[PDB]
Amino acid sequence: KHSLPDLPYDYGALEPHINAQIMQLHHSKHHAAYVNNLNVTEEKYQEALAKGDVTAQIALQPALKFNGGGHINHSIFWTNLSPNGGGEPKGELLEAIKRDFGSFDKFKEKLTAASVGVQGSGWGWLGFNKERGHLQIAACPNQDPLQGTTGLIPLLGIDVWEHAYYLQYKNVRPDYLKAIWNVINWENVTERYMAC
Amino acid sequence: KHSLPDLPYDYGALEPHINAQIMQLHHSKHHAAYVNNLNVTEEKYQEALAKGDVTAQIALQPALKFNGGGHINHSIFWTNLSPNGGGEPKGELLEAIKRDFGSFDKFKEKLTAASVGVQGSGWGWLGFNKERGHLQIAACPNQDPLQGTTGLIPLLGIDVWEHAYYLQYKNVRPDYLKAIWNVINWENVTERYMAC
Ligand SMILES: [K+]
Ligand SMILES: [K+]
Ligand SMILES: [Mn+2]
Ligand SMILES: [Mn+2]
After folding, report:
1. B62 CA: distance to closest CA in chain A (Å)
2. Chain A nearest C-alpha distance from B194 (Å)
3. Which residue of A has its CA nearest to B142?
4. Bridge partners, residue A140, by sequence
5. Do B18 and B180 form a contact (C-beta atoms < 8 A)?
6. Nearest ligand to the CA atom of B74
7. Rounded to an integer, what distance in angstroms lies between the CA atom of residue A173 and that of residue A176?
8. What's the rounded Cα separation, in Å, for the pair B66 and B70?
9. Which of A58, A76, A96, B15 is packed most tightly, with the most Cβ within 10 A?
C-alpha cells in the first residue's frame, strides 16, 4: 500500500514562482488520485497474478504505469522544489554538469528545450546514466517514470503537464520554466546524485 | 498555406458552459500556434522531399503530425460547438445512434467514458466507419487526428487536453464533459454524418 506523501512545505511557500492554488490542486487532487488508483490497480494485479491470468495482467499495464508513474514522478517533484531553493548547485554536481553540458547555463538551456518541446503531457528530466557514468537529459510522455522506462536514475524533474502551470502562466510554457529555476532544491538534487 | 479559421461566434458565446477566457486562449493562442508551426513544417518538408532527403522527411514526422493534427482537430471542434447547440440530435443521426449504441444516453455515457479515460492529453471522438457502415467511438492521444491515423471520418470531437477546461473546471474533467453537452452543435454533426 502506497500513500500520499506530506508536502515538506506550505502550499504557498513557492510564491510568486508557483502560486498556492496550483500547489494545492497538484498535490491534494492530482497526486492523491494517482496514489489511490495505484493502490486499486496493484490490488487487482495481485489477484490476476495469483491465478495466473496473463490477459488480466497485460490489460492492467496501462493503469499501473500511468498511476504508478504519477505517484513516483510527483513524489520526486515535491522534493526537487524548495522555498529556499534556486541559484546554482555547488560541489561535485556542478562539476559533473560543466563536464557533461559545458556550463550550468548550457544545461539550463538543454533541460528547458527538452521540457518545452514535449508534445502533449510529459516530463523533462535530468538523470544519471549508471552504465556510462554521466548525466543525461531525457523527456518522458504522460506519467511514464524515468527509471522504470529508460533505466536512468532521476535527479531533477520538471512537470510540463498543463495542470502544472496553466492557471498561472496559461499557454506560455516558457514563462513557467523560466520561473521554476528559482525554487529548484539543488540540495536534494545533489543528494540523489551522490547516491548513485 | 493554411490559416487560423475565424470563430463562427463570439468568444463568450458558450457561457456559462465554457467561459470566454478559455475560448479566447484556446483559439487565438493554442490553435494559432498549431497553424503557424504547421506552415513552417510543411515548408521544410517540401524542401526535403524535393531533394529526396528521406532522413529529413522522417525527422519531421512528429512535428507535422502534432501541428497538422492540432489544426485539423481544432478546426472541427469549433464547428462542433454552438451557442444554439445542446439537446439531442434528430433524424437519421439519432436513428444511427440508437442503432449502434442502444440509445442516445448510452451513447453519451460511452463517449464520456472514452474522453475521461484518456491518460494524458488527447481527444474523444464519435466517428463513422466507412468500411463497416456504422458509428464508432475512439480516443486519440495528443493531437493525432482521427481520420489520418484510424481511417474513421470524424463527426464530433471533445478536446480533453487540460487547457480546454482547467481554468474553469480544474482537475474535475467529468464536470467539463457534463457541461459541454449543452453546446454541442448537433446540426453540424448531422452534416458531417450525411456527407459520408
Ligand atoms: K510509497
Ligand atoms: K486550411
Ligand atoms: Mn503533475
Ligand atoms: Mn485544444
Report:
1. 9
2. 33
3. A120
4. A123
5. yes
6. 4
7. 5
8. 6
9. A76
Output Rg (C-alpha) for chain A, integer angstroms: 17
**What does residue B185 show for φ and ψ, rounded to 5 degrees?**
-85, 80
* A143 vs B contacts (CB less than 8 Å): 119-120
Measured between its terminal Cα atoms, the distance across chain A in Å is: 26
What cell was used for B125?
A: 471522438
B20 touches chain A (CB under 8 A): no
* Structural contact between residues A86 and A184, judged by C-beta atoms closer than 8 angstroms: yes
Q: Do A121 and B162 touch (CB under 8 A)?
A: yes
CB atoms within 10 A of CB B161: 23
Phi, psi (degrees; rounded to nearest 5) at A53: -80, 90
Measured in angstroms, the resolution is 2.4
Dist CA B97 CA B125 (whole Å): 14
Helix (H, G, I), strand (E, B) or coil at B122: strand
Place of cell 493554411: B2
How were these coordinates obtained? X-ray
Q: Which of A4, A133, A157 is nearest to A79 (CA)?
A: A157
Q: Which residue out of A121, A123, A167 would a mutagenesis test of the B interface target, given it has the greatest number of B Cβ atoms within 10 Å?
A: A121
Spacing, Cα A39 to ligand 1 middle (Å) = 10
Residue B161 and residue A33: Cβ atoms within 8 Å?
Answer: no
Binding residue per annotation — A163?
yes
> Does the beta carbon of B9 lie under 8 angstroms from any beta carbon of chain A?
no
Shortest CB distance from A162 goes to which of B142, B143, B166? B166
Q: Which amino acid is at A98?
A: K
> Which residue among A119, A122, A162 sits closest to B62, beta carbon to beta carbon?
A119
Domain A83-196 listed as CATH 3.40.50.720: no
User: Which cell goes with A23?
Assistant: 500547489
Give the contacts of A95 (CB within 8 A, at least 6 positions apart).
none
Q: E strands of B21-178, at which residues? A: 122-129, 134-141, 153-159
The CATH number for B19-82, chosen from 1.10.287.990, 1.10.340.30, 3.40.50.1580, 3.40.630.40, is 1.10.287.990
Cα B9 to its chain centre, rounded Å, is 17
**Domain residue ranges in chain B:** 19-82, 83-196
Q: For residue A72, which ligand has an atom nearest its CA?
A: 1
Cα–Cα distance, B47 to B57 (Å, whole number): 9
